[PDB]
């Protein structure tokens, strides 16, 4: 039972960074594995997933 959300508002240039995504995600979104991935529109965005046992 977890949740996820994408914020296109964020800079795509950061997508290249793997430690930057989760850093900005786990920061505000308090996610756990915040990372970016190609969307259905071939658009690269940073998605944040928040899960709590």
């Amino acid at each position: 039972d977890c949740k996820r959300k994408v914020y296109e508002n964020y800079p795509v240039s950061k997508c290249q960074l793997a430690n930057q995504c989760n850093y900005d995600c786990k920061l505000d979104k308090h996610a756990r594995s915040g990372e970016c991935f190609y969307d259905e529109k071939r658009n690269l965005q940073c998605i944040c997933d928040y899960c709590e046992y």
Side-chain angles (χ1 to χ4, degrees):
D1 178 65
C2 318
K3 44 270 269 186
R4 54 83 149 183
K5 174 156 272 206
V6 58
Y7 215 55
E8 75 208 289
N9 266 264
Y10 278 131
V12 179
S13 35
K14 270 56 172 305
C15 180
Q16 306 185 351
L17 277 277
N19 286 307
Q20 184 91 304
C21 242
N22 87 73
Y23 168 79
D24 163 282
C25 286
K26 304 155 75 68
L27 167 138
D28 265 326
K29 315 235 91 265
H30 284 296
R32 204 189 185 72
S33 191
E35 214 187 4
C36 73
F37 267 124
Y38 62 89
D39 218 70
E40 62 153 21
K41 300 201 78 174
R42 288 90 89 187
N43 291 114
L44 323 178
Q45 313 173 33
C46 194
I47 307 95
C48 315
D49 186 302
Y50 176 50
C51 199
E52 179 162 53
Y53 201 81

